[PDB]
Amino acid sequence: LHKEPATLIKAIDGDTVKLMYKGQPMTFRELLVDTPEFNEKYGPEASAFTKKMVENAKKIEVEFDKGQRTDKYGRGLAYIYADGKMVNEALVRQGLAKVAYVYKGNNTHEQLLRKAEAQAKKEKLNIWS
Numbered sequence: 001l002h003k004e005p006a007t008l009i010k011a012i013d014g015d016t017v018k019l020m021y022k023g024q025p026m027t028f029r030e031l032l033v034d035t036p037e038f039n040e041k042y043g044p045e046a047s048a049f050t051k052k053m054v055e056n057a058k059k060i061e062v063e064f065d066k067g068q069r070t071d072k073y074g075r076g077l078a079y080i081y082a083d084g085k086m087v088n089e090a091l092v093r094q095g096l097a098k099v100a101y102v103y104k105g106n107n108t109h110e111q112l113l114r115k116a117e118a119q120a121k122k123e124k125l126n127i128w129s
C-alpha cells in the first residue's frame with residue numbers, strides 16, 4: 001500500500017474525519033475500527049483523541065487498501081496517518097476503538113491492529129477497563 005497526501009478540513013468523531021484529498025473535500029471513515037458514538041461511553045474521549053491527533057499533525061496522509069475505496073455513504077475508506085503514525089492503530093492501542101468491520105480484501109493491517117487491541121486489553125485501558 002501507498003500513503004497519499006491529504007489536508008485536514010475538520011475533525012468529526014473518533015473514527016471519521018473530513019479531509020481534502022486530490023483537492024476535493026471528502027469524509028473518511030477509518031478502516032478496521034469502531035469508536036463509540038459521541039453519546040456512548042468513551043465516545044467523547046475517542047472523538048477528542050482523534051481530533052488532537054489530526055489537528056496537531058503537520059502532515060496528514062491517507063492510505064487506501066486493496067478493495068473498495070468508498071463505502072455506501074460515499075465516505076472514503078482508508079488508514080489515516082498523522083505525522084507518520086496511524087490514527088486507526090493509535091485509537092485501538094489506547095482502548096478507544098475496537099477492531100471491527102473487517103471485510104475480506106480491505107484488511108491489510110488487520111493483524112497489526114489486533115496486536116494493538118490485545119495490548120490495550122491486557123492493560124485494561126478505557127473500553128477494556
Ligand SMILES: Cc1cn([C@H]2C[C@H](OP(=O)(O)O)[C@@H](COP(=O)(O)O)O2)c(=O)[nH]c1=O
Pocket residue numbers: 029030031032033034071072077101103
Ligand atoms: C468501516 C466500514 C464501515 N462500513 C459501513 C458498515 C456500516 O453500515 P450500517 O450504516 O448499515 O450500520 C457503517 C458503519 O459505520 P459507522 O460505524 O461510522 O456507523 O459503515 C463499510 O461499508 N465498510 C467499512 O469498511
Ligand SMILES: [Ca+2]
Pocket residue numbers: 015034035036037
Ligand atoms: Ca462508529
